[PDB]
Amino acid sequence: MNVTLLIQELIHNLFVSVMSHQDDEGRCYSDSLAEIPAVDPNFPNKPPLTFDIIRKNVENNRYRRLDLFQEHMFEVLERARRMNRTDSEIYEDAVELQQFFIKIRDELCKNGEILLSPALSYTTKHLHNDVEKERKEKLPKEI
Ligand SMILES: [Zn+2]
């Protein structure tokens, strides 16, 4: 559909950037998250959400707020982290994508003079702290 908001353009740019992010061998990180189930059986009441579902919303300009877009993206990435071992490709790709998401989010918001968004309350430092805590929790279970 038709972009009527700066934030829709920003969200599209952010989504494409994150989905296209590649490792040093040109492997797309998002590829390993293609088969993540839409519903974690441990949390069966959360609405189905996948990158395919978020894409459809992004392309049809359905996100009019950064915080909702970030919430959905973080649901998927956090599910991939929860459901997989710290030594796995999926886990590590999910963390990398989440870190990259924050980096590009911040850059686009600076460029667009987006200051107020509640999405910006969750910083790179918060993500580092939260990932480090999860790694520590998970370690003994992976022995
Ligand atoms: Zn597009």
Residue numbers in the entry: 740 to 882
Give sentences copied directly from the paper behind this entry:
Despite large sequence variations, all BRD modules share a conserved fold that comprises a left-handed bundle of four α helices (αZ, αA, αB, αC), linked by loop regions of variable length (ZA and BC loops), which line the Kac binding site and determine binding specificity. The four helices form a deep cavity that is extended by the two loop regions (ZA and BC loops), creating a largely hydrophobic Kac binding pocket.
The C and N termini are highly diverse and may comprise additional helices that extend the canonical BRD fold (e.g., the sixth BRD of PB1 has an additional C-terminal helix) or largely extended kinked helices that are present as C- or N-terminal extensions (for instance in TAF1L or ATAD2). A conserved tyrosine (Y97) defines the N terminus of the ZA loop helix present in all BRDs except TRIM28 and the sixth BRD of PB1, which have unusually short ZA loops that have lost this structural element. The proximity to the Kac binding site suggests that this insert may play a role in recruitment of acetylated binding partners. In contrast, the second, fourth, fifth, and sixth BRD of PB1, MLL, and TRIM28 interacted with only a few histone Kac peptides.
